[PDB]
Design a protein around this ligand. Structure first.
Ligand SMILES: CO[C@@H]1O[C@@H](C)[C@@H](O)[C@@H](O)[C@@H]1[Se]C
Ligand SMILES: CO[C@@H]1O[C@@H](C)[C@@H](O)[C@@H](O)[C@@H]1[Se]C
Ligand SMILES: CO[C@@H]1O[C@@H](C)[C@@H](O)[C@@H](O)[C@@H]1[Se]C
Ligand SMILES: CO[C@@H]1O[C@@H](C)[C@@H](O)[C@@H](O)[C@@H]1[Se]C
Ligand SMILES: CO[C@@H]1O[C@@H](C)[C@@H](O)[C@@H](O)[C@@H]1[Se]C
Ligand SMILES: CO[C@@H]1O[C@@H](C)[C@@H](O)[C@@H](O)[C@@H]1[Se]C
Length: 310
């Protein structure tokens, strides 16, 4: 290890946002603060002068953004209340209004979060697990934080992946949410603007480790076409990837890169496609590492140890 790496909590929650290749990564330090490391033509920060929030130890972490003009980062308080750190260009970092709504979740709850694609308005959908194990949507459409749709029972402590896009032939957002059911299967729930929430659970993986991390992204939306990638930590201690490609659907499942036992993961993407995955693989014991995919080089390890580790 290194003194910087030692600051990073083992099995920390990880989230990330970006605008093309301008990247922000969020993780929890060993004292329970949430920090931001940044990539602007090089990695920086992740230090004790870059704290944006403070959360229970072991907190789930989720983030979402409009480019890097608006960023939101979600975690839990010590009383398992959903809370929000918010950044707006020219306003700085501040506490969002979410904690004020006092949404109490299961202590083992994960969190998923997205801005709704295809509008300039700041509309948010947040997904977490309540004490009855249901996955609950919470929303902001400008008028205060309100409960939205409840997506049904999931495994206690299930990972929660979520992504959102707008098809170019549609008048609204599409959302997909992935989590794990009591049978240990990995499933999809879907929302399209005219159908609303589909009733059916779609299976994407037959059996996965209990409470494995789950993270998803999308790229190249078009006329009734999308590309999606969903990542999870499998029983061979690697991140696996489930591909949705237009015309083929859920046609490829494969290992991507090794991780430490119970690593969390984050994924971002941009058009190309460029993929960046973040996780812990044992580098300096506790540092966060990056995996990359692009057309130029395909699958390649990226930054070995994110700030503050190096
Ligand atoms: C210019 O501000 C940076 O970019 C913002 C989008 C953000 O993530 C700030 O925390 C960092 Se700190 C230098
Ligand atoms: C306008 O409300 C802010 O942006 C919204 C999209 C949201 O995250 C609110 O909680 C914060 Se509170 C200032
Ligand atoms: C229009 O319906 C709302 O926005 C959709 C995009 C979605 O997130 C619905 O569950 C909620 Se219903 C509380
Ligand atoms: C068009 O299919 C839908 O959208 C895709 C992106 C996907 O999530 C399918 O499972 C559902 Se249901 C066939
Ligand atoms: C052709 O490359 C695929 O799409 C890339 C964007 C990527 O995510 C690869 O792992 C997969 Se491998 C089925
Ligand atoms: C050009 O640098 C790469 O793309 C950046 C956007 C970034 O994530 C770097 O760590 C990697 Se290292 C192969």
């Amino acid at each position: 290890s290194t003194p910087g790496a030692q600051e990073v909590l083992f099995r920390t929650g990880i989230a990330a946002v970006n605008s093309t290749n301008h990247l922000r990564v969020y993780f929890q330090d060993s004292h329970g603060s949430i920090r931001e490391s940044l990539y602007e033509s090089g990695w920086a920060n992740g230090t004790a002068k870059n704290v944006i929030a403070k959360a229970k130890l072991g907190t789930p972490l989720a983030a979402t953004s409009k480019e890097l003009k608006n960023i939101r980062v979600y975690s839990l308080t010590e009383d398992n209340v959903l809370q929000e750190a918010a950044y707006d260009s020219g306003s700085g970092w501040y506490n969002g209004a979410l904690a004020g709504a006092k949404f109490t979740v299961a202590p083992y709850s994960r969190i998923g979060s997205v801005f709704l694609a295809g509008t300039n308005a700041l509309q948010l959908r947040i997904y977490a697990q309540k004490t009855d194990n249901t996955i609950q949507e919470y929303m902001w459409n400008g008028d205060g934080w309100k409960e939205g749709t409840n997506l049904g029972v999931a495994l206690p402590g299930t990972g929660i992946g979520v992504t959102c896009w707008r098809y170019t032939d549609y008048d609204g957002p599409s959302i997909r949410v992935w989590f794990q059911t009591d049978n240990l299967k990995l499933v999809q729930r879907a929302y399209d603007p005219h159908t609303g929430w589909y009733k059916e659970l779609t299976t994407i993986f037959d059996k996965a480790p209990p409470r494995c991390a789950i993270a998803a992204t999308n790229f190249n939306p078009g006329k009734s076409s999308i590309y999606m990638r969903i990542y999870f930590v499998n029983s061979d201690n690697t991140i696996w990837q489930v591909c949705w490609d237009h015309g083929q659907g859920y046609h490829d499942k494969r290992t991507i890169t090794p991780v430490i036992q119970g690593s969390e993961i984050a994924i971002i993407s941009w058009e190309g496609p460029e993929l960046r995955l973040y996780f812990q693989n044992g580098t300096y014991v506790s540092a966060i590492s990056e995996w990359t995919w692009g057309k130029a080089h395909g699958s390649q390890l990226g930054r070995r140890a994110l700030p503050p580790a190096e």
